[PDB]
């Protein structure tokens, strides 16, 4: 799943260019799309969380043929979002069907990264004599929150 | 051998490169080794197992 | 075809006379866990 | 009998008359390739949220071909084709119709009904078993296991 | 009189005036076989949500042909035809009318009325039967058997 494939999906879905169009977008435009994917992933490190994207090494510009490392399960979701971000570049506006597809793919991606933090006991809560803290277990109160 | 924390030194000097080392014993001997130790060297426990249905 | 009685209808029975007549005196409690898989009696 | 990705893509195209067999006498191989790639990617995405439904992905690394067998039962093909049609309609810039949306919704709802689980609520684990359950004679203990109970004894860890 | 897949498809085509006996223009058999295929897949999919209505499917390898008999009664003909019409109008890129929608809804409601069956909740299984049922002599149960 090279970075270039993700960019090609974005342009084909809104029809700007395709392996069919008599016309085609210049090479410079594709580089901007690869650079936009990297800003996308840099931001996605924060809100959606880490996914497994392999960023460029120190002091190399990203290349369209470079490996990305995201599994093909998340490909539709990553591609649809990028299209919305760079759609306005070509002076266009998205459609409700495209918006719904992107939203559904985003929910599908989010369903794969749940947390459910499952908060623990306070730390001063007593442990009853039913646990037999005298013999079987040393602690007479809950251990705490596992610091750092 | 920690220079920043001399409190926990347990050897006269640091092991630098090219130091001389040796192996105590013989090439392929087999023997039954005798032991010596303190009370608090190792600890052994046998944890109980729970009953079933 | 909805109400059903609990009492099962009577059936057919054989009879037990051979086990009663045969000898159950000498060989009884002789095949124990120590004797093995067989036991022998003497002859005149 | 057998479901082929080529016929799924052809059904998706025909249901919106992008390339039919009555109105138009043309089918485009570029459209076929785009459709089959979209179907592959969409199935890969579906592998998580709706759950596996028996689709077979391309082994190795060579690209899928329309002549291969999907392996899907024939009762899912309408839902698959509709959901594919909605995804690929942007390329020809044709907006969808409310009747098509309703049909896709009903097909997807039927698939959802077919693929339900509705799990049950197991016992907590420290909840006592009643005195009338006859422990010390039956297999039951004073308390519920709260985990899958031992089934053999040869494998006792789980 | 025995209903056939071809008869159902012809009814569905006629009811919205796409093709009929009186028309001076008629559609190729490719459209007819596409329609019968659509009927086959729709009715195979109908095995889960609405239930079983007695439809006969192709015997494995063999493809469906219009001349064979589906086995459905005359009652379900309008329901099946209207559903096929609603699923097939998009092929010719048309829009169903409100009267057609209402008629299809009425016939589908009739189909649900025919198919409907409601279950009964059996006793839990630890529910006492009561001394008044003569559980000593007349019935062997002190508690209800439960679901079977």
TrEMBL record, chain B:
This is Gene 5 protein. It comes from Shigella phage Sf6.
UniProtKB/TrEMBL annotation, chain D:
Gene3D superfamilies: P22 tail accessory factor (Gp4) (1.10.3230.20). This is Gene 7 protein. Ca(2+) 3 binds at residue 60. GO terms for biological process: symbiont genome ejection through host cell envelope, short tail mechanism. It comes from Shigella phage Sf6. Ca(2+) 2 binds at residues 54, 71. The keyword Nucleotide-binding does not apply. Keywords: Calcium, Metal-binding. InterPro entries: Gp4_sf, Tail_accessory_Gp4. Ca(2+) 1 binds at residue 1. One of its GO terms (molecular function) is metal ion binding. The keyword Calcium applies.
């Amino acid at each position: 799943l090279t970075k270039g494939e993700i960019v090609l999906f974005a342009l084909r879905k809104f029809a700007i260019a395709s392996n069919a169009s008599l016309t085609d977008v210049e090479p410079q435009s594709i580089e901007d799309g690869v650079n936009d994917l990297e800003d996308m992933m840099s931001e996605w490190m924060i809100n959606p969380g880490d996914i497994g994207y392999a960023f460029a090494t120190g002091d190399e510009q990203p290349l369209p043929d470079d490996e990305s490392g995201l599994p093909r399960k998340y490909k539709h979701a990553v591609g649809y979002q990028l299209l919305l971000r760079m759609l306005s570049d070509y002076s266009l506006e998205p459609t409700p069907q495209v918006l719904s597809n992107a939203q559904r793919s985003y929910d599908a991606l989010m369903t794969d990264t749940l947390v459910v933090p499952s908060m623990r006991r306070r730390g001063d809560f007593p442990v009853g004599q039913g646990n037999k803290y005298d013999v079987f277990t040393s602690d007479r109160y809950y251990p705490g929150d596992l610091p750092l | 051998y920690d220079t920043t924390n001399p409190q926990y030194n347990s050897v006269s000097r640091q092991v630098e490169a090219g130091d001389a080392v040796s192996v105590v014993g013989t090439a392929s001997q087999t023997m039954k080794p005798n032991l010596f130790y303190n009370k608090f060297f190792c600890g052994l426990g046998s944890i109980p197992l729970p009953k079933l249905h | 075809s909805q109400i059903v009685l609990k009492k099962f209808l009577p059936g057919f029975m054989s009879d037990l006379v051979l086990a009663k007549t045969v000898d159950r005196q000498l060989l009884a409690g002789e095949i124990n866990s120590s004797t093995g898989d067989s036991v022998s009696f003497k002859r005149p």
